[PDB]
Design a protein around this nucleic acid. Structure first.
Length: 134
RNA sequence: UGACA
């Protein structure tokens, strides 16, 4: 009861995460907190086991969002991820994870780990990688 | 000088 946060779980996508979070908080409230939970935090891309620092949860696009390829092949997250790495999205109706370095614009550290992630593949971490050297 | 977006 009234449980929150998660000490860097082994395996679980932030979709499954933000999912349980969907079963608690209100609507407006929901989105506000959830993000705070993943924001500044990082996720593990199941398809390419690569972790990026989620600084913003894209509560607009779904794992279906598309984009053209080299020659212009329009493939969706679901596709690019399923065909190239086969990570079966499945929850093709949740948001996205806009991972951004969002450096402190201070001196010249420049933060790393930017990426448009699928919440259904992001193994919640706890990295919160700050590494920049400002 | 934004490293499988």
């Amino acid at each position: 009861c009234t449980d929150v946060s998660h000490k860097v779980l082994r395996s679980e996508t932030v979709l499954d995460f933000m999912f349980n979070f969907y079963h608690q908080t209100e609507e407006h409230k929901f989105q506000e907190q959830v993000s705070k939970e993943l924001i500044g935090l990082v996720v593990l891309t199941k398809y390419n086991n690569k972790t990026y620092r989620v600084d913003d949860i894209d509560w607009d696009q779904n794992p279906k969002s598309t984009f053209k390829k080299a020659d212009g092949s329009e493939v969706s997250f679901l596709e690019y991820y399923r065909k190239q790495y086969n990570q079966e999205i499945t929850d093709l109706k949740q948001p996205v994870l806009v991972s951004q370095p969002k450096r402190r614009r201070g001196p010249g550290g420049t933060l790393p780990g930017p990426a448009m992630l699928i919440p259904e593949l992001c193994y919640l971490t706890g990295l919160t990688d700050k590494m920049r050297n400002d």
